[PDB]
A paper describes a structure:
The main protease of SARS-CoV-2 (Mpro, also referred to as 3-chymotrypsin-like protease or 3CLpro) is responsible for the majority of nsp processing, cleaving at 11 conserved sites along the polyprotein including self-excision of Mpro by autolytic cleavage of its own N-terminal and C-terminal autoprocessing sites. SARS-CoV-2 Mpro is a functional homodimer of two symmetrically disposed protomers that are each 306 residues in length (33.8 kDa). The active site of Mpro features a Cys145-His41 catalytic dyad, which orchestrates nucleophilic attack at the carbonyl carbon of the invariant P1 glutamine and the formation of an acyl enzyme intermediate central to efficient peptide cleavage. Using C-terminally substituted Mpro chimeras, we have determined X-ray crystallographic structures of Mpro in complex with 10 of its 11 viral cleavage sites, bound at full occupancy intermolecularly in trans, within the active site of either the native enzyme and/or a catalytic mutant (C145A).
Finally, C7, C9, and C13 (all in the context of C145A) have crystallized as rings composed of seven dimers. These all belong to space group C2 with C7 and C13 having seven monomers (half a ring) in the ASU and C9 (C145A) having 14 (complete ring). Notably, the large 14-mer ring structure composed of seven dimers has been observed from three distinct C-terminal variants crystallizing in different conditions. Analysis of the crystal packing with PISA27 shows the main interface between dimers ranges in surface area from 800 to 1000 Å2 with the ring assembly as a whole predicted to be stable. However, we do not observe evidence of these in solution and oligomerization appears to occlude free access to the active sites for external substrates suggesting that barring some negative regulatory role or inactive storage form, the oligomers observed are likely crystallographic rather than physiological interactions.
Numbering used by the authors:
A (entry chain A), B (entry chain A): 1 to 306
């Protein structure tokens, strides 16, 4: 019983974090085999961050300009490549703690765990979701760039996010591990803003089906709605329109419980218009969009053979 | 910017988790040097869990009755001691991944990070607080006993909780690492219940001072209250009475901001009686009691030199 927002265990990622310093600019890098991946703006001085020409900044930088430290071990840079917004530093030492890994680019709505680091030291770990506007509603301070986001399936760490910058609004933006930005953003200290943040309707649906499994069935269906109508009421509450793939992605949830997406969309229809009153669902006092279908079923209470 | 419930990085604890099996009963153990600490009810068969005599169950158990596995490595038990509700298995192999550690018994209100394991494999990590009734509002399934809770100061892991059982209500109960239970509970499958769960008022106060620092100052003080009056309104909302130590524990928060505990107690006075309306604080739509003063200041936005 119980229902918490869990991150994956962070140990396999902790063994890859290092400090990268170029000049008087320091952030974090991800050390896999003999390459350290880090945001490319580690090469920029304070003023160069308004409109950098990263090409030209890098061509003036030699290897000794880079200090990379794994704890008390200095790793010497023997070469570099710029790949999109991420800089690959080849180092003289292959990381003996490299886990089985891959790079994957996630989709908005999907969740992952973040290991927030400063000065190459892991600070803490927390679970989050890619918002539909491609930002993450994270918790990041200056010096946290290079912190990565990941998922762990069996023993294989799928890295999906590297952290670069914070938007004026306070939300965060970054790239995959190939350095391509998530969203229409750029690594430049320039006035930028994200689109309108919708709510991940499919995630809130998987959440309600969860409540139904564990026992919280207050506010359960008492009506119906054509997918279109829900979208109309959801539009006023910046709720991401619901598609039939959304209706199918629930998989073993409309079933294995026997309630319908529309019946749930109807309970959601009311809680967005009339409110939650004083009651709560799975502890949360607000509709939750950071749980996906896989996250839901893992924590759900099981049947007891007697 | 941003404000998330962060667990400490779990890696140092992951390297200590093992599987402990006695007979046909399996749970997790904590492997430090050449001792594995695990809940003592690993020695009980299904029926022995209503009213066990652990003394007598253990005296009938020899070392070979214990299978302890660290991954693919079997660790042979060479002796055991029962210490309160925790069983110490001495093993033929000292754990080379033992971090610098200590055992500490935390106080209700204090937070810690939980590494939930099944079959000796870390499953995920999440931050929680010891409730005033000594339960933890965790997320635990059968087989998760032996999962531990911890804090990390610098590189020293302070283990503070080992997980034993789930109450009828769905909340969780466990011991320190000396095996003394947190609360008036026992490792027996018997009808048990916790006291009334109060809210950690000092934690909600540190939270509001945080909101004030980061910028959310809606609902800020517009009145005053003698500590006594707040307690009167807090009594109806099962809010833990507020003491002057509580008023002093804020430390650099009433100051370093300049608002008063009572002014905050007054804003809290209203949000408990009239409500939060449609607004939220630091994202949460409910009053939060799982952040302490230290948790608050670490994540708060800093001043930019210009």
């Amino acid at each position: 019983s119980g229902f918490r927002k869990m991150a994956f265990p962070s140990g396999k990622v902790e063994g890859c974090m290092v400090q990268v310093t170029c000049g008087t600019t320091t952030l974090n890098g991800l050390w896999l085999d003999d390459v350290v991946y880090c945001p490319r703006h580690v090469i920029c001085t304070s003023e160069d961050m308004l409109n950098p020409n990263y090409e030209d900044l890098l061509i003036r930088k030699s290897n000794h300009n880079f200090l990379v430290q794994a704890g008390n071990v200095q790793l010497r840079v023997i070469g570099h490549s710029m790949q999109n917004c991420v800089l690959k530093l080849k180092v003289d030492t292959a990381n003996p703690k490299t886990p089985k890994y891959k790079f994957v680019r996630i989709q908005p709505g999907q969740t992952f765990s973040v290991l927030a680091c400063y000065n190459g030291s892991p600070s803490g770990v927390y679970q989050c979701a890619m918002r539909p506007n491609f930002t993450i509603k994270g918790s990041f301070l200056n010096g946290s760039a290079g912190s990565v986001g990941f998922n762990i399936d069996y023993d294989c760490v799928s890295f999906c996010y590297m952290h670069h910058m914070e938007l004026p609004t306070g939300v965060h933006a970054g790239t995959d591990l190939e350095g391509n930005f998530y969203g229409p953003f750029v690594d430049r200290q320039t006035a930028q803003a994200a689109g309108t943040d919708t709510t991940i309707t499919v995630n809130v649906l998987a959440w309600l089906y969860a409540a139904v499994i564990n026992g919280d069935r207050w506010f359960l269906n008492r009506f119906t709605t054509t997918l279109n109508d829900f979208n109309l009421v959801a539009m006023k509450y910046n709720y991401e329109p619901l598609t039939q793939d959304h209706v199918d992605i629930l998989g073993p949830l409309s079933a294995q419980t026997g309630i319908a997406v529309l019946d749930m969309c109807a309970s959601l229809k009311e809680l967005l218009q009339n409110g939650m009153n004083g009651r709560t669902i799975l502890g949360s006092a607000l509709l939750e969009d950071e749980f996906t279908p896989f996250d839901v079923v893992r924590q759900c209470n099981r049947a007891t053979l007697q």
